[PDB]
């Protein structure tokens, strides 16, 4: 139903009209009137606020409010509501996350990796599986993943050449991503990477002490000193574009603005630092008690974010990027289990890398190419329009849709929202909105 969200952040009052995507910057009196506008008449509102605002200035702000509602920018209704009643939608797989190896040279503690190389034959099966399951979609994505993919880099190159040849016959266009811990980068494979990887993700958690506390070799020592210069080299050889450094923050580093700003101070223009996934009973998960400190941390990062963009020493922070010009997105989410699937070196298919450890979620194996459609449709139909909690949530059209892995990890049910996750996600959106308001 019709719904707004309003918040006040660092002095700016912001109003979100949920169904239309309209976003407004309002003065204090409008902010206060909005507490009452739907359930009270103009006369009752004038009496309820008369201790603070005179009747003329209230009617003035009032005359602006229903003018905005008359044109669909406040308390608008949902135009996509009637259409969504579809559950027979054939899913189209658009991307595969290839676990190129389950071995690694680190024992990062928050990681699912804490085994086998994928054969070129399995990788070729994964390509052919993605072509037959992508239907008539030309643009396909392959993320080279796993434990550490560069420990099986020859198979990565054969997969690319294989897929690059299948493009002509099937009118496909593959875009390849590589995510690496960096330990095995060098001049020669970075040259290949800049010729062939449309995107590369470089894993580093921020300050050296934060990074080397979590991202640990089998002997127990840190990796910051080794990977940092390699990452700056990669960043600069790609003109500070088409990459990002990717950190994970846990309960151990809740002052994570310090880590984002450390990566910024080291020259990285493209940064993503994200909360740990599936960390139940780990000692790491952010808890409900931690939300006030994390909220203040996002706000202090946003303020500094605006300041550096104003002064010119800019950097991009993935969770602050947002498009204020926008049904397909509201039904898909991250796509795990239906549009986005992970493949093990053995070739087994899972919804995403966070489910690979659980055969209850195995959906088939690419060497045969026969996907369990019931699991695919179950993940497909678990989305923002079908979860009851999302239906009353103001961020439903801005959020990334939730994380099935978190949901299963904390409630053993992909359809139950992970509350800590939602509140962090809603606060991030609030910050991204305040940033847009600061840069009118």
């Amino acid at each position: 139903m019709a719904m707004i969200h309003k918040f006040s952040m660092m002095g700016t009052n912001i109003v979100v009209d949920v169904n239309s995507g309209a976003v407004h910057v309002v003065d204090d009196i409008s902010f206060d009137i909005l507490d009452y506008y739907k359930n009270f008449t103009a006369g009752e509102i004038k009496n309820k606020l008369a201790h603070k605002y005179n009747a003329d200035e209230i009617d003035e702000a009032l005359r602006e409010i229903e003018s905005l509602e008359a044109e669909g920018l406040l308390f608008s209704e949902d135009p996509y509501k009637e259409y969504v009643s579809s559950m027979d939608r054939k899913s189209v797989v658009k991307a595969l996350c290839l676990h190129i190896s389950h071995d690694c040279n680190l024992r990062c503690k928050y990681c699912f990796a804490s085994r086998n190389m994928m054969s070129l034959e399995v990788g070729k099966k994964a390509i052919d599986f993605l072509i037959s399951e992508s239907g008539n979609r030309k643009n396909l994505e392959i993320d080279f993943f796993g434990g550490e993919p560069m420990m099986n880099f020859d198979v990565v190159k054969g997969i690319i050449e294989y897929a690059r040849q299948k493009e002509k016959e099937h009118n496909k266009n593959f875009r390849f991503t590589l995510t690496t811990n960096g330990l095995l980068l060098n001049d020669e494979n970075i040259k290949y990477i800049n010729e062939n990887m449309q995107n590369i993700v470089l894993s580093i958690d921020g300050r050296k002490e934060v990074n080397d506390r979590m991202r640990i070799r089998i002997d127990g020592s840190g990796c910051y000193d080794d990977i940092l210069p390699k990452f700056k080299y990669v960043a600069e050889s790609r003109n500070q574009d088409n990459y990002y450094v990717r950190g994970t923050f846990t309960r151990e580093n809740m002052d994570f603005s310090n880590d984002v700003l450390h990566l910024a101070d080291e020259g990285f223009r493209q940064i993503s630092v994200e909360p740990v996934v599936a960390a139940k009973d780990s000692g790491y998960d952010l808890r409900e008690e931690d939300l006030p400190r994390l909220f203040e941390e996002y706000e202090k990062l946003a303020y500094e974010y605006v300041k550096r963009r104003k002064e010119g020493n800019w950097f991009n922070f993935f969770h602050f990027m947002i498009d204020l010009t926008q049904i397909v997105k509201r039904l898909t989410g991250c796509g795990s289990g239906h549009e986005y699937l992970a493949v093990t070196p053995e070739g087994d298919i899972y919804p995403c890398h966070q489910f690979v450890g659980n055969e209850k979620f195995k959906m088939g194996n690419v060497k045969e190419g026969v996907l369990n459609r019931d699991i695919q449709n179950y993940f497909k139909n678990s989305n923002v329009y079908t979860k009851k909690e999302c239906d009353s949530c103001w961020a439903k059209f801005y959020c990334s849709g939730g994380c099935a892995a978190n949901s299963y990890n904390f409630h053993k049910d992909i359809n139950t929202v992970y509350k800590v996750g939602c509140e962090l996600e809603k606060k991030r959106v609030e910050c991204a909105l305040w940033i847009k308001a600061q840069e009118m």
């Binding site: 912001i14 109003v15 995507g21 309209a22 976003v23 407004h24 910057v25 309002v26 003065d27 009196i29 409008s30 003035e60 702000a61 602006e64 409010i65 003018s67 905005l68 920018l73 993503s272 994200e274 993935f318 204020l324 010009t325 991250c334 795990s336 986005y340 995403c352 990334s400 909105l433 847009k436 308001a437 009118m440």
Partner: peptide, 11 residues
């Protein structure tokens, strides 16, 4: 307006 100002007119 005067009291309102319209702003828009991982894995």
């Amino acid at each position: 307006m005067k009291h309102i100002k319209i702003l828009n007119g991982g894995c």
